[PDB]
Amino acid sequence: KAGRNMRRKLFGVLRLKCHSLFLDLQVNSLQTVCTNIYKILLLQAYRFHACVLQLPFHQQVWKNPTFFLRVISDTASLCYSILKAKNAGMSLGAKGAAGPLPSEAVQWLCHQAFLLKLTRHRVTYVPLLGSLRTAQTQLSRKLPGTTLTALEAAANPA
Ligand SMILES: N[C@@H](CCC(=O)N[C@@H](CS)C(=O)NCC(=O)O)C(=O)O
Ligand SMILES: N[C@@H](CCC(=O)N[C@@H](CS)C(=O)NCC(=O)O)C(=O)O
Numbered sequence: 001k002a003g004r005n006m007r008r009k010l011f012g013v014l015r016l017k018c019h020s021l022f023l024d025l026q027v028n029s030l031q032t033v034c035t036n037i038y039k040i041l042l043l044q045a046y047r048f049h050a051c052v053l054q055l056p057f058h059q060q061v062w063k064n065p066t067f068f069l070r071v072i073s074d075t076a077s078l079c080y081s082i083l084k085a086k087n088a089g090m091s092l093g094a095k096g097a098a099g100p101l102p103s104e105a106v107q108w109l110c111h112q113a114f115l116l117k118l119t120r121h122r123v124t125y126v127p128l129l130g131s132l133r134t135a136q137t138q139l140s141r142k143l144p145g146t147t148l149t150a151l152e153a154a155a156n157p158a
Contacts, residue, residue, distance in 0.1 A: 008046060008050075012043065012047070015039075015043060016040060016043060019036040019037070019039050019040045019043075020036075020040070020082065020086070022036040023036055023037060023082070023083050023086040023087070024086050024087060024096075025087050025090060025094050025095065025096025025097055025100055025101075026087070026089065026090050026091065026094045026095065026096065027095060027096075028095065028096055029095060029096055030096045030097045030101075030147070030150070031150065031153065031154060032096075033083075033096055033101065034101070034105070034109065034150065034151055034153075034154035035154040035157070037079055037083060037101075037106060037109060038109045038112070038113055038154050038155055040079055041075065041076070041079055041106075041109055041110045041112075041113040041114070042113040042116070042117070044075050044079075044113070045113045045114045045116070045117040045118070046117060048071065048072075048075075048114070048117075049117055049118070049121065052068075052124070061124055061125055061127050061128065062126075062127040065127045065128060065131070068128055069128060069131055069132075072110065072111070072114055072128075072132070073107075073110075075110055076103070076106050076107045076109075076110035076111075077103075079106055079110065080101075080103045080106040080107075083100075083101060083106060084100070087100045087101075102143070104139055104142055104143050105143075105145075105147070105151060107135075107139060108136065108139045108140075108148070108151055109151060109154065109155065111132050111135050111136055111139070112136070112151075112155045113155070114132060115129065115132055115133070115136070116155070118132070
């Protein structure tokens with residue numbers, strides 16, 4: 001427990017730096033880009049949960065659920081902005097895909113990563129799991145680009 005916390009704290013910045021180097025669809029496969037942005041978002045979800053555990057006892061999650069959901073949304077926006085900048089010089093012969101990832105896909109990966117972590121602590125996060133679970137289908141009805149299952153593949157490896 002104290003060993004896991006030490007490892008997350010120690011490797012946080014380095015892991016994020018490393019993942020950020022594999023987001024360029026010009027040189028990387030789409031599967032790689034999706035996996036690495038997802039691993040970034042999952043890392044962020046763990047940091048999120050750590051930060052929530054140290055909120056005052058009266059600052060319950062059901063008390064201000066807009067705050068937490070917006071934090072989650074802002075995470076997707078920020079990772080998406082990073083991804084955009086990293087893919088700015090993309091050309092027609094890019095290895096990754098014909099299309100650089102829409103914000104819908106980064107959003108989907110974000111909600112996925114947060115759900116996986118937040119379902120482990122339902123007693124704390126039952127107010128949020130409602131809105132996030134719909135957003136998944138809200139986005140799954142917004143864009144089933146087939147590649148939706150290629151996103152599910154990136155959220156799968158252990
Ligand atoms: N992410 C690289 C491989 C490099 C690698 O494995 N190093 C980092 C990820 S950038 C790491 O922390 N290892 C994998 C993990 O622990 O999830 C790739 O997809 O080809
Ligand atoms: N502690 C985070 C790593 C991120 C981090 O280093 N930031 C804060 C977390 S709010 C920190 O300095 N750690 C103090 C703590 O959680 O005891 C984690 O468990 O993943």
